[PDB]
Amino acid sequence: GASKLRAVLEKLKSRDDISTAAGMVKGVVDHLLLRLCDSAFRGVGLLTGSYYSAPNEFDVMFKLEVPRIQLEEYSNTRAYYFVKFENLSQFLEGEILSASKMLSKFRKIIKEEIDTDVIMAVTLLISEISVDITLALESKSSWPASTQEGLRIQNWLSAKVRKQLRLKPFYLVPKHAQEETWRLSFSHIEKEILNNHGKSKTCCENKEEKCCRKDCLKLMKYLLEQLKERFKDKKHLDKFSSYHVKTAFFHVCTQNPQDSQWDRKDLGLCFDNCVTYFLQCLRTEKLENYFIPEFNLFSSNLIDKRSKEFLTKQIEYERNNEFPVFD
Amino acid sequence: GASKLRAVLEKLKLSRDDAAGMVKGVVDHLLLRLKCDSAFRGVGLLNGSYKISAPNEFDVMFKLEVPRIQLEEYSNTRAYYFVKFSQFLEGEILSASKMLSKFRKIIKEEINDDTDVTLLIKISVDITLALESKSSWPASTQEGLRIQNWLSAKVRKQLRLKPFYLVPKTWRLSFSHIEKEILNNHGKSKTCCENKEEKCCRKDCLKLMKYLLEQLKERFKDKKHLDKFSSYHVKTAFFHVCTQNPQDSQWDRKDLGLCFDNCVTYFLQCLRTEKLENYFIPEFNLFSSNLIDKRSKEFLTKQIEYERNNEFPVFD
Numbered sequence: 257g258a259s260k261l262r263a264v265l266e267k268l269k270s271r272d273d274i275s276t277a278a279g280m281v282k283g284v285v286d287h288l289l290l291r292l293c294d295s296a297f298r299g300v301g302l303l304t305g306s307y308y309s310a311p312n313e314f315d316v317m318f319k320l321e322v323p324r325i326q327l328e329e330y331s332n333t334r335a336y337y338f339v340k341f342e343n344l345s346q347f348l349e350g351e352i353l354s355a356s357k358m359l360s361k362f363r364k365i366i367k368e369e370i371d372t373d374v375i376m377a378v379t380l381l382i383s384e385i386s387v388d389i390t391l392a393l394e395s396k397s398s399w400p401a402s403t404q405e406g407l408r409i410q411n412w413l414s415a416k417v418r419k420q421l422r423l424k425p426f427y428l429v430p431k432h433a434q435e436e437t438w439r440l441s442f443s444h445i446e447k448e449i450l451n452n453h454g455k456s457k458t459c460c461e462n463k464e465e466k467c468c469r470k471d472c473l474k475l476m477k478y479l480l481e482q483l484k485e486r487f488k489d490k491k492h493l494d495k496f497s498s499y500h501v502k503t504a505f506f507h508v509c510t511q512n513p514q515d516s517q518w519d520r521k522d523l524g525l526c527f528d529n530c531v532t533y534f535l536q537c538l539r540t541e542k543l544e545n546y547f548i549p550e551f552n553l554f555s556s557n558l559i560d561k562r563s564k565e566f567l568t569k570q571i572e573y574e575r576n577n578e579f580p581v582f583d
Numbered sequence: 584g585a586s587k588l589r590a591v592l593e594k595l596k597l598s599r600d601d602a603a604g605m606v607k608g609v610v611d612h613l614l615l616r617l618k619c620d621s622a623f624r625g626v627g628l629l630n631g632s633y634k635i636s637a638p639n640e641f642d643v644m645f646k647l648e649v650p651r652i653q654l655e656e657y658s659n660t661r662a663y664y665f666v667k668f669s670q671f672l673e674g675e676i677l678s679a680s681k682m683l684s685k686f687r688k689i690i691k692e693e694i695n696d697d698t699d700v701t702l703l704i705k706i707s708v709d710i711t712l713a714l715e716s717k718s719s720w721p722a723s724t725q726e727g728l729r730i731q732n733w734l735s736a737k738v739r740k741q742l743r744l745k746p747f748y749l750v751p752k753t754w755r756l757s758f759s760h761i762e763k764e765i766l767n768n769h770g771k772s773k774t775c776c777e778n779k780e781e782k783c784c785r786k787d788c789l790k791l792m793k794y795l796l797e798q799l800k801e802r803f804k805d806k807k808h809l810d811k812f813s814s815y816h817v818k819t820a821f822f823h824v825c826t827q828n829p830q831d832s833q834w835d836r837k838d839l840g841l842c843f844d845n846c847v848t849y850f851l852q853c854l855r856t857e858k859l860e861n862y863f864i865p866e867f868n869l870f871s872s873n874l875i876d877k878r879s880k881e882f883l884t885k886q887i888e889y890e891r892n893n894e895f896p897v898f899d
């Protein structure tokens with residue numbers, strides 16, 4: 257029953273509709289970067305606008321190079337940190353850097369340069385299409401000791417690649433934990449190891465090496481969004497996001513490191529295994545962050561078992577009926 | 584027969600411990616005095632080590648980013664260029680003679696602060712200055728670096744967005760950085776030579792053919808028939824065979840004897856047909872009659888054919 261999934265893939269490929277709309281966004285973003293003329297946002301750049309069933313919604317991240325940072329871990333929560341440190345000290349509240357103040361001037365300088373308006377990091381609605389903008393510090397120092405045993409790809413993309421990827425800078429993003437904390441972000445690494453997906457360097461570059469990894473992730477996200485929309489009336493699925501399903505997908509990738517276990521003929525079986533693993537994470541309330549292995553996205557402190565037991569029930573019914581949410 | 588190949592591969596690994604700290608400190612220190620001068624302000628050694636049977640001889644390159652540069656090719660050579668962009672502009676062109684003189688002059692000054700002058704210390708490291716250009720690579724490289732069936736097209740695109748380097752010789756193309764990259768990341772699989780199940784003999788094949796040429800260059804040191812051949816020819820031919828043999832299973836270290844034989848065979852086909860294209864500039868034949876004459880190739884050919892016919896007595 258894999259043709260119904262490829263029929264979904266066929267309809268999912270809204271290909272030109274996102275291509276023509278991204279040009280309108282490119283102007284707004286390029287017309288946003290010049291105005292942050294600010295001393296505070298001098299070295300601000302971006303991180304190819306992403307688009308996680310909604311071709312009219314975008315999210316771009318604005319990198320801000322911050323040199324000579326030093327991080328204090330919050331409270332054994334290995335993903336949230338305080339930031340310490342030719343000098344810029346407006347938001348420097350004592351020694352910790354005020355995330356709320358630093359985000360306020362970011363919202364302020366952006367609201368000045370903006371049928372384009374702003375909603376309550378930053379979302380806008382141009383020409384009636386929305387763009388989420390995110391502020392991120394860049395630290396070219398070594399990755400925090402909380403990441404050392406994460407990104408277990410040595411058996412899949414090789415240890416030589418993992419050492420190379422950990423040479424790259426990491427990113428911190430304002431995110432409360434109960435406030436004034438920044439969270440570790442490796443979205444750039446996620447982009448890297450998704451477009452260089454295979455164990456073979458020529459994977460998917462020829463008909464004999466066509467795998468179904470990207471297609472499995474796309475259906476995982478599509479399944480979640482469809483059910484997130486179907487049950488919009490209640491809020492049981494509001495705490496789930498495509499970051500969870502893509503983190504689970506990465507754990508299936510390190511579990512099945514060979515390209516032979518991802519042949520496009522076995523798309524139905526491979527996707528069935530991807531759905532099976534995501535359900536196991538739901539029931540056991542365990543899905544470690546791919547880069548911070550001690551950070552549990554599915555801990556009871558973040559999502560309650562009632563909402564996971566609801567998501568599990570919906571997915572189990574879907575798999576047992578050839579996924580009607582696709583119809 | 585492959586037992587003898589692994590024997591010299593073993594003896595070639597014991598001569599590696601002796602060593603690279605003295606070379607590293609002197610190259611580090613002299614880079615500070617280079618930033619003293621404005622012309623060398625952005626200068627920087629590019630990755631530190633370097634014949635193979637000569638452990639006391641190194642070769643370093645010094646990258647100095649020259650920006651916003653227009654290259655115009657010297658009369659269809661497709662590999663030598665004039666650098667049209669202020670101490671060394673003879674005309675509208677620059678001058679490697681004036682650049683290297685200012686290089687060798689500034690290089691001379693700092694040295695006198697037990698090292699003579701290529702700086703002999705015993706060991707003697709050779710230094711090379713390279714122009715860096717982050718611009719798109721010249722059109723002569725358009726059909727070179729044919730690795731899309733071996734290391735994929737994505738890797739080829741990623742390598743070509745890296746800068747290309749020019750070296751005084753007119754200035755000639757140099758892709759030594761790209762050579763090292765594909766050498767230590769050599770397999771179709773990313774875990775090639777990283778586990779017991781995916782162990783290839785590509786690197787061993789390159790070391791053997793280099794040791795093959797150097798030893799015969801030493802044996803016939805007086806005949807002057809092989810002094811024009813260099814390890815860059817061996818490595819260039821090795822890359823072509825890697826293109827001809829993309830799959831890692833065609834490089835199983837179970838078949839080191841056959842893999843090395845297939846390497847010397849291709850190298851001999853280049854010597855006989857007098858064609859060895861530059862791996863990056865396919866229209867630049869290193870084995871041309873204007874460079875190496877036929878008598879030298881025929882002598883090198885005959886010497887390798889006898890060697891392979893007798894299980895390489897030079898490897899003793």
Ligand SMILES: O=C(O)c1cccc(NC(=O)c2nnc(-n3cnnc3)[nH]2)c1
Nearest residue numbers: 662756757758811812813815861869874
């Ligand atoms: O040109 C020759 O026939 C020749 C013969 C012997 C030695 C060298 N010189 C090098 O050691 C070299 N190292 N890289 C290159 N190279 C790069 N792209 N084209 C040539 N030559 C050149």
Ligand SMILES: [Zn+2]
Nearest residue numbers: 454459460467
């Ligand atoms: Zn693939």
Ligand SMILES: [Zn+2]
Nearest residue numbers: 770775776783
């Ligand atoms: Zn290998």
